[PDB]
Structures are given as C-alpha cells and as structure tokens.
C-alpha cells in the first residue's frame, strides 16, 4: 500500500522545480520529490501517469530522484541508475523516460509500454544528411572533415549503437554529451552536426525549438522501435495491476490527453 518510487529528471516526462517560495509547498500539478542523496517538486507526463496509477490502484508513494547515475547502465557486473534502484530493491518501481531493452528486461520486470519511442537523429534544418543510413554516419572517418555526431552516453541509446553499430559507436565516443540541454546547444553552435537520441524526447524538442530550426529524422530500419515502461522488481506483484491500469488509461483516451497536455509543440 506504500511504494517507494525512483525517478529522474528528463523534460517533459519528469520536470523538477523548487517548492513555491511563498507557500514552501508543491503547488499546481506538482508532487514532492526528494533526492537520493538525502524542498523539490516534480511534474510532467510521467508524474501525471504516476498520480493516476496511485489513485486508480490505491497506493501511497514516496518519490525520489536518482543521483547514482541516470536511467541504468551495467558496468563490471553492477547496475546503476533507476534500473539499479529497482534491481537492488531500493525502490519498488521506477518511472520516467525509461526505455525497455533486452538487457534490462532480463533483470527487472517492465509494465506494458505507455510511450512509443526508439532512436532518431536531430540535425539543423540546413544540414544535408539523409538520415542514419548515411555513410557520413556509418563510415564516419571516410571523408574530409568528419561529421561530428554524438549522444548522451550510458543509456539505451548508446547500448543500442554499441551492440549494433560498434564501429560507428567508437567514433561517437569523443562527441558524448552530458545532457540533452548541452547537446542541443552544441548542435545549434555547430559543434555537433547531429545528435542521436531517444525518439520521444528528440521529437518533442524539435516541436518546441525556437525558430523551428531543428529537425529530427527517424532512424527507419537502422534501429528498432521500443517504448518507455515502468520498471518493477522481477516477479513483482505490482506488474499486473499497473498493466491493467495503463491499459485502461489508454482506452479511456487518458494517455492521449496527457500527450496533448505535455508533448505538444508548435513546429511541424
Ligand atoms: C530516454 N531513455 C534513456 C536514455 C537513452 O535512451 O539513451 C534510457 O532509458 O536509457
């Protein structure tokens, strides 16, 4: 009846803000969230999902922001990030822009996916590349000044590229970005020619770009389609109620409403 939930900031799925200085509380559609290191309030698409699950299923929760890495990476036998919090049973569940992949699915249970995603590439509107099938990407060191392109490492995007396109991955390493905000800054400054990342996030960023100067190209057949899912302990008794609720939200057009509310933009 009381769940500990791990999350991670990734706008607009999870957005972190200070408490209202006037009231010292979380007002509007926000909820209290503390840091794993230990005030702060969280809102966004995934938080609205969490609020609805809590109400529909009938649990209370304690929400915290992960500081031990980000989404989840396995290094030398040990998981960090949201996946690690769930895998090591520090949290009952983790929710945010958490991408379902084979590696993670082996060790945690995932809810049914509630956001469709995958991998896409974002470029400046003028930049002449065809997409991720382009040799500028695929054979990066075959030309005069090489194309500069990178990702934010340590997550499902990098894992997918390393597994499927190890030569391209080795090239991208020097262009790793610390977060999406910095990657976008480098794209606009021409320090990167392309940014390869989660499709749901990139599409949102392109829809919100000032001047509509950034465009995304879907990866097509280069990478598979997947989804965000809620991570739970392997064998969790929470998987079924959560799945049924999510499936219900989908059919009630509640998820579509949340998409309109949180993910809509101006550019097309
Ligand atoms: C939005 N997904 C994150 C970051 C990434 O895909 O690289 C992840 O699940 O790892």
From Swiss-Prot:
Tissue specificity here reads: Expressed in brain, mainly in the subcortical region.
UniProt-annotated glycosylation sites, renumbered to this chain = 38, 154
Localization (cell): Cell membrane; Postsynaptic cell membrane
Binding positions for L-glutamate per the UniProt entry: 97, 99, 104, 156-157, 198
Q: Which cysteines are joined by disulfide bonds?
A: 26-41, 33-42, 212-267
The residues exposed to the Extracellular compartment are 128-268
Spell out the subunit comment: Heterotetramer. Forms heterotetrameric channels composed of two GluN1/zeta subunits (GRIN1), and two identical GluN2/epsilon subunits (GRIN2A, GRIN2B, GRIN2C or GRIN2D) or GluN3 subunits (GRIN3A or GRIN3B) (in vitro). In vivo, the subunit composition may depend on the expression levels of the different subunits. Interacts with PDZ domains of PATJ and DLG4.
Sum up the protein's function in the record's words.
Component of N-methyl-D-aspartate (NMDA) receptors (NMDARs) that function as heterotetrameric, ligand-gated cation channels with high calcium permeability and voltage-dependent block by Mg(2+). Participates in synaptic plasticity for learning and memory formation. Channel activation requires binding of the neurotransmitter L-glutamate to the GluN2 subunit, glycine or D-serine binding to the GluN1 subunit, plus membrane depolarization to eliminate channel inhibition by Mg(2+). NMDARs mediate simultaneously the potasium efflux and the influx of calcium and sodium.
Name the protein family: Belongs to the glutamate-gated ion channel (TC 1.A.10.1) family. NR2D/GRIN2D subfamily.
Q: What domain notes does the record hold?
A: A hydrophobic region that gives rise to the prediction of a transmembrane span does not cross the membrane, but is part of a discontinuously helical region that dips into the membrane and is probably part of the pore and of the selectivity filter.
Protein name, please? Glutamate receptor ionotropic, NMDA 2D
Residues of the whole record sequence present? 427 to 826 of 1323
């Amino acid at each position: 009846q009381h769940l500990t939930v791990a999350t991670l900031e990734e706008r607009p799925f999870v957005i972190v803000e200070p408490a209202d200085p006037i009231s010292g509380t979380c007002i509007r559609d926000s909820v209290p969230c503390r840091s794993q290191l230990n005030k702060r309030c969280c809102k966004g698409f995934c938080i609205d999902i969490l609020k609805r699950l809590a109400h529909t299923i009938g649990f209370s929760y304690d929400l915290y922001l992960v500081t031990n890495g980000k989404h989840g990476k396995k290094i030398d036998g040990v998981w960090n990030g949201m996946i690690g919090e769930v895998f090591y049973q520090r949290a009952d569940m983790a929710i945010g822009s958490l991408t379902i992949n084979e590696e993670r699915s082996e060790i945690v249970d995932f809810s049914v996916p509630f956001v469709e995603t995958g991998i896409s590439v974002m470029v400046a509107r003028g930049t002449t590349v065809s997409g991720l099938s382009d040799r500028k990407f695929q054979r990066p060191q075959e030309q005069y000044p090489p194309l500069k392109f990178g990702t934010v490492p340590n997550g499902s995007t990098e894992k997918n590229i390393r597994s499927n396109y190890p030569d391209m991955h080795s090239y991208m390493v020097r262009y790793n970005q610390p977060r999406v905000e910095e990657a976008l800054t480098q794209l606009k400054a021409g320090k990167l020619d392309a940014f390869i990342y989660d499709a749901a996030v990139l599409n949102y960023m392109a829809r919100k770009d000032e001047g509509c100067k950034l465009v995304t190209i879907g990866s097509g057949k280069v990478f598979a389609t997947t989804g965000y899912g809620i991570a739970l302990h392997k064998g969790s008794r929470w998987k079924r109620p959560i799945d049924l609720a999510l499936l219900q939200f989908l059919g009630d057009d509640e998820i579509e409403m949340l998409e309109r509310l949180w993910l809509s933009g101006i550019c097309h």
